[PDB]
């Protein structure tokens, strides 16, 4: 069975890189992020060719990498989508978890 990697993973496909820590996401099943593709949970890097490899941040199709990390109403939760739900009405948590700058994702 796949094992989570070490904390401090840098997502760095863009000029706004973001650190991801598995240890803070244990309340989330692995396959909610490493989601099924052709019926099997896929543990490849999200931006693998044929996956979320479109680096046009304006693309709203499934292959758009920005879209996959930021948008609501997606088939699997995005980073920002799930964080918005988590923050609820708490403005401090909305800033920490969903702010576009000065958040835990982007400085
Ligand atoms: C569940 C305990 C779980 C496992 C297992 C797991 C594994 C895993 C691997 C093996 C990697 C490395 C991939 C590589 O080859 O680079 C990896 C990377 C990322 N993960 Fe993960 N992961 C588990 C859980 C979760 C959860 C719950 C989320 C989403 C909240 C998540 C996300 C990520 C992300 C993002 C990465 C980086 C991918 C990248 O493209 O570099 N994982 N995980
Ligand atoms: C990496 C951990 C990773 C993330 C994060 C992720 C997210 C993601 C979202 C949010 C969606 C929904 C988009 C929408 O509804 O518009 C989505 C959908 C698909 N993904 Fe993905 N995804 C990650 C990893 C991977 C990998 C490694 C591949 C390629 C093997 C891949 C592919 C796809 C496909 C295909 C879809 C659409 C699925 C369907 O319609 O059932 N993703 N992903
Ligand atoms: C998507 C790849 C993604 C990123 C990036 C991400 C980041 C992130 C950070 C930076 C934190 C703060 C703690 C830390 O420094 O590790 C954090 C915390 C929470 N997250 Fe997250 N997160 C990503 C995705 C997801 C997904 C898809 C969910 C829900 C399904 C989720 C949830 C949470 C929760 C819960 C926390 C803790 C919140 C807190 O108040 O402490 N994240 N994540
Ligand atoms: C707030 C809604 C918000 C904005 C706006 C935003 C912007 C942003 C940009 C411009 C990029 C780079 C896109 C490109 O291709 O040039 C980027 C990248 C990532 N972001 Fe973001 N972002 C906002 C908020 C958040 C939050 C709160 C998280 C974490 C939950 C987050 C995550 C990510 C991830 C992951 C990336 C990709 C990192 C990489 O691979 O380089 N964003 N964002």
Q: CATH number for the domain including 66?
A: 3.90.10.10
What is the DSSP code string of 31-54?
Answer: GGTS-EETTEE--S-TTSTTSS-B
Annotated binding residue at 67? no
Domain span including residue 65: 1-107
- The alpha carbon of 37 and the centre of ligand 4 are apart by a number of angstroms equal to 24
3-state secondary structure of 64: strand
105 is in an annotated binding site: yes
Greatest extent of the chain over all pairs of C-alpha atoms, in Å: 39
Stated in angstroms to one decimal place, the resolution of this structure is 1.1
* Measured torsion, CA atoms of residues 71, 57, 97, 105, in degrees rounded to the nearest 10: 150
For the CA of 43, the closest atom of ligand 2 is 27
102 in the Ramachandran plot: left (φ > 0), alpha (ψ -120 to 50) or beta? left
Element (H, E) at 98: helix 91-98
Residue with the smallest CA separation from ligand 2 atom 15 is 74
For residue 1, the Cα-to-chain-centroid distance in whole angstroms is 22
Assigned token pair, 56: 């046009």
Q: What's the CA gap between 52 and 61, in Å, rounded?
A: 9
CA distance 8 to 55: 23
CB 68 within 8 A of CB 78: yes
Report how many domains make up the chain.
1
Of ligand 2's atoms, which has the minimum distance to the CA of residue 68? 10
Beta strands in the chain (DSSP E): 9-11, 18-20, 36-37, 40-41
Q: Position of tokens 């990498």?
A: 65
Looking at ligand 4, which atom is closest to the CA of residue 103?
Answer: 27
DSSP code of 23? G
């Amino acid at each position: 069975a796949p094992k989570a990697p070490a904390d401090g993973l840098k997502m760095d496909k863009t000029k706004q890189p973001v650190v991801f820590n598995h240890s803070t996401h244990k309340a989330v099943k692995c396959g909610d992020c490493h989601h099924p593709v052709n019926g099997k949970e896929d543990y490849q890097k999200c931006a693998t060719a044929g996956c979320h490899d479109n680096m046009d941040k304006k693309d709203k199709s499934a292959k758009g990498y920005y879209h996959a990390m930021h948008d609501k109403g997606t088939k699997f939760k995005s980073c920002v989508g799930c964080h918005l739900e988590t923050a609820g009405a708490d403005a401090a948590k909305k800033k920490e978890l969903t702010g576009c700058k000065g958040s835990k994702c982007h400085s």
